[PDB]
Design a protein around this ligand. Structure first.
Ligand SMILES: O=P(O)(O)O[C@H]1[C@H](OP(=O)(O)O)[C@H](OP(=O)(O)O)[C@H](OP(=O)(O)O)[C@@H](OP(=O)(O)O)[C@H]1OP(=O)(O)O
Ligand SMILES: O=P(O)(O)O[C@H]1[C@H](OP(=O)(O)O)[C@H](OP(=O)(O)O)[C@H](OP(=O)(O)O)[C@@H](OP(=O)(O)O)[C@H]1OP(=O)(O)O
Ligand SMILES: [Zn+2]
Ligand SMILES: [Zn+2]
Ligand SMILES: [Zn+2]
Ligand SMILES: [Zn+2]
Lengths: 467, 350
RNA sequence: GGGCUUUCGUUUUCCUAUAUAGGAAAAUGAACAGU
């Protein structure tokens, strides 16, 4: 498409612009307007009235690079284009609506919503403890050397980051007097706390997680059954399923870790190679095998695991079960005994909302992202997912960035009289926890050896930053 | 000033390829003279361990800057071929002190243009960020080596980054060890960057990293070697969208004395693109032949009997300056510079 | 897409001088580059 400035006239304080829309070889009515923006708007408008029906204008030039290739994957992509779970979904969407009940209208576009719910006992109605949105990631140009950017903005990732913030706040509130009212209890020996046996966590995602959890058409939608059994039913129809995959920059689809030996480097990515962020399904598998508390929090807590995952669209039991937890158990249980307690695999109950909301438009997916934690009250953080910073001219720091998490870690280490950890860097602090690092390395080695590829890590200059 | 350099390099490349990551070396006879592109190179790849050759028939770094330097070396060999008593006035070389060696004339200078920043310490900065170096962090200024399968580098069979090699050029000269036997060191007058230009980290990367702790390094540098501080500039207008388009691993090299005959190599191996696997004209063997012809023409039969390693170590001044520069880099806390085993350079021409 | 940070150019108002030109505050419309 082209918008030609046919003519500019008039004095600087009241100019008149004359614009014309052109698509390929077809020209449209020329228009007078008061501003360039409105010139383009009226030119487009005239073209559309001429051809809402011809559609000639519609076909030309998409900008980012493309390749959904797994095997003959073009037909698959074209086909794709064309606790009581309902309680979790209603809680998540009511919390979102209440938070954004009277905010700016920019949050009226399509979005992906994720939430984490905590249930203190059996009759607990349920309370949202996190919330995240967004569908984009950062570019290779927008990375930071001091951890001032968020490398992802998918809804589940931001939700887990909010859960991390909530865990930090709840650890702040803990003390000797209010040990009973707190969700934590002393573990064996009292060195590190642990979650109470009555407290559980659930996760709801408005769509299927990107990656190994969405290689099937929407027409493959299974019906909702309230099966009492908790035993999963994974299906390994082809070898290609089970492969790991990354969200490449400026590309469309979700492509496996190929025989692409391009080593992620800081200056290399700056010079123009493709930045690959891992898919959300792989990250959820990592949470199920390691824990939602990350690596820093494991100093004071045993791993925190999930109990259920509720999806609002594109649910398939045999696909999602393998995507999140069963793909590490395909070749026997020999992987389970290798892992060391308190690190163990987690098999959360998978579920689907009773009926999907059929209004799922494919196009016009904006980049804005929203974050909210329990401690924040009514405060929501809105980020521009393309840059990984707070959406605004000042592009201030994001409260879910690695720097703020490190600040919270320093505050908690000072509060808990952990002087030795107070003098370490971010990378060394993460490497201080021998058990979590050993479990993570073993899990990656097991993934590689059994035959699903190799995990893609950010450049070492980006993980270990300067503070 | 740098806009003319960039446009000259681009025009020369387009004209030669009529029948991108592109570096060039440009020689400007005088200030009023526009200048002429003298060496040209392209590429982004580096060979691996399997492509390493003991006899030296493969170029172990097909990057743009390195291959442009190799082309410039070949051009300098050609000019030394052209030098005689009759053409002494019209040449660019003049007798130096003592009459033992020639030297570059004062008016003629050389400049370098690179389309993007060199790998290594030249692109370690974010959007937040007389020479004005920047040393705000302990990690800054460290040596980095090129990684296989990529354009990037990792901090310290390993090939130092382009930034470290540009520093080595700015300290020990451009002509290399062999040309020292017939020339004084030559230093770039200016370095021009097309993309990824930071003043602080480029001047720290290429020149100023050995001036962080005062002037305790220059005094120990025996003459004529000096710590050059070339003028650093950027092209005025630049393409906005960073270019992520996939790039072929072919490398094009050319020198002013070759007319209209470009050579194409593949960076994965380091040989001329063709089933016969021709020997590259910027390889070690061709350079050694060119030098042995210069020595035969100059009646210096002493240097003929020396092999590549012996002739390279024959230049006592250059090798002492190189060792001193390496030791000074190791002292200030930058890690040990890696050198390939001498068996690679211990080859005799047939 | 949004959004903070030299102009061109309107009126009113103030002043100079002789209705006139000039200077000044305000906002008003397009471009603009650092984030
Ligand atoms: O996307 P996130 O949920 O924020 O995960 C990030 C980060 O992922 P990104 O690639 O998106 O930045 C790291 O993954 P890799 O870079 O290694 O691929 C990983 O860090 P580690 O692998 O070193 O553990 C992880 O760490 P954790 O498991 O502790 O949550 C965590 O890092 P941050 O918490 O610092 O953001
Ligand atoms: O080909 P270049 O990159 O321009 O540099 C090569 C080589 O570096 P590479 O092996 O990475 O290509 C030598 O460095 P080493 O790795 O061998 O240590 C280096 O110095 P030395 O030969 O003394 O080691 C230099 O030589 P010079 O000092 O003359 O610039 C030169 O060597 P060649 O031009 O003979 O290949
Ligand atoms: Zn996703
Ligand atoms: Zn399972
Ligand atoms: Zn390079
Ligand atoms: Zn300098």
């Amino acid at each position: 498409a082209e918008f030609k400035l046919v003519d500019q006239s008039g004095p600087p304080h009241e100019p008149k612009f004359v614009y014309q829309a052109k698509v390929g070889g077809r020209w449209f009515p020329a228009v007078c307007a008061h501003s360039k923006k409105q010139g383009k708007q009226e030119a487009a408008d005239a073209a559309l009235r001429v051809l809402i029906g011809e559609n000639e204008k519609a076909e030309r030039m998409g900008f980012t690079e493309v390749t959904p290739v797994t095997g003959a994957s073009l037909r698959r992509t074209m086909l794709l284009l064309s606790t009581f779970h309902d309680q979790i979904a209603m809680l998540s969407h009511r919390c979102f609506n209440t938070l954004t009940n009277s905010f700016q209208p920019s949050l009226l576009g399509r979005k992906i919503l994720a939430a984490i719910i905590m249930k203190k006992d059996s009759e607990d109605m349920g309370v949202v403890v996190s919330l995240g949105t967004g569908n984009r990631c950062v570019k290779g140009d927008s990375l930071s050397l001091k951890g001032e950017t968020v490398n992802d903005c998918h809804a589940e990732i931001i939700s887990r980051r909010g859960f991390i913030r909530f865990l930090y706040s709840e650890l702040m509130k803990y003390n000797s007097q209010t040990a009973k009212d707190s969700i934590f209890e002393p573990a064996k020996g009292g060195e590190k706390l642990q979650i109470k046996k009555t407290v559980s966590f659930h996760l709801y995602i408005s769509t299927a997680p990107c990656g190994d959890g969405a290689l099937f058409d929407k027409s493959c939608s299974d019906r909702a059954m309230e099966s009492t059994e908790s035993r999963h039913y994974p299906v390994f129809e082809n070898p290609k399923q089970g492969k790991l995959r990354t969200k490449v920059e400026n590309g469309e689809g979700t492509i496996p870790v190929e025989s692409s030996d391009i080593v992620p480097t800081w200056d290399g990515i700056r010079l123009g190679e493709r930045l690959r962020t891992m898919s959300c399904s792989d990250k959820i598998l990592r949470w199920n095998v390691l824990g939602l508390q990350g690596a820093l929090l494991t100093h004071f807590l045993q791993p925190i695991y999930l109990k259920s995952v509720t999806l609002g669209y594109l649910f398939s039991q045999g696909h999602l079960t393998r995507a999140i937890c069963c793909r590490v158990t395909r070749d026997g249980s020999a992987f389970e005994d290798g892992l060391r307690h308190p690190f163990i695999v987690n098999h959360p109950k998978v579920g689907r909302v009773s009926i999907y909301d059929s209004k799922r438009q494919s196009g016009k997916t904006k980049e804005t992202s929203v974050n909210w934690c329990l401690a924040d009250g009514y405060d929501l953080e809105i980020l521009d997912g393309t840059r990984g910073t707070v959406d605004g001219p000042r592009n201030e720091l994001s409260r879910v960035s690695k720097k703020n998490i490190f600040l919270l870690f320093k505050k908690l280490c000072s509060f808990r009289y952990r002087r030795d950890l107070l003098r370490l860097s971010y990378g060394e602090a993460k490497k201080a926890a021998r058990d979590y690092e050993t479990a993570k390395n073993y899990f990656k080695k097991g993934l590689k050896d059994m035959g699903y590829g190799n995990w893609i890590s950010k450049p070492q200059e980006e993980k270990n930053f300067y503070l | 000033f740098h806009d003319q350099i960039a446009m000259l390099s681009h025009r020369c490349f387009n004209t030669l390829t009529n029948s991108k990551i592109l570096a060039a070396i440009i020689m400007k006879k005088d200030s009023e003279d526009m200048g002429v592109v003298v060496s040209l190179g392209t590429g982004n790849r580096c060979v691996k361990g399997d492509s390493l050759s003991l006899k030296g028939e493969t170029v172990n770094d097909c990057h743009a800057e390195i291959i442009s330097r190799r082309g410039f070396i070949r051009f300098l060999y050609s000019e030394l071929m052209k030098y005689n008593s009759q053409t002494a006035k019209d040449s660019i070389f003049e007798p130096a002190k003592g009459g033992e060696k020639l030297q570059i004339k004062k008016t003629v200078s050389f400049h370098l243009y690179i389309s993007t920043a060199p790998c290594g310490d030249g692109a370690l900065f974010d959007k937040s960020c007389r020479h004005y170096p920047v040393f705000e962090n302990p990690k800054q200024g460290k040596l980095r080596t090129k990684v296989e399968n990529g354009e990037g580098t990792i901090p310290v069979l390993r090939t130092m980054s382009c930034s470290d090699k540009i520093l080595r050029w700015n300290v020990l000269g451009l002509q290399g060890a062999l040309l020292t036997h017939f020339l004084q060191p030559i230093y770039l007058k200016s370095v021009t960057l097309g993309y990824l230009f930071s003043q602080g980290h480029l001047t720290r990367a290429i020149c100023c990293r050995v001036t962080r702790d005062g002037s305790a390094f220059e005094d120990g540098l025996r003459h004529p070697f000096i710590v050059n501080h070339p003028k650093v500039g950027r092209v005025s207008i630049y393409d906005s969208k960073r270019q992520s388009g996939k790039t072929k691993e072919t490398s094009v090299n050319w020198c002013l004395a070759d007319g209209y005959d470009l050579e194409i190599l593949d960076g994965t191996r380091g040989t001329v693109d063709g089933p016969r696997n021709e020997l590259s004209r910027v390889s070690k063997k061709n350079i050694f032949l060119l030098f042995k012809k210069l020595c035969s023409f100059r009646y210096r039969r002493d240097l003929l009997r020396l092999s590549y390693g012996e002739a390279k170590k024959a230049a006592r001044d250059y090798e002492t300056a190189k060792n001193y520069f390496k030791k000074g880099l190791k002292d200030m806390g930058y890690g040990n510079w890696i050198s390939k085993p001498q068996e690679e350079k211990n080859f005799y021409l047939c």
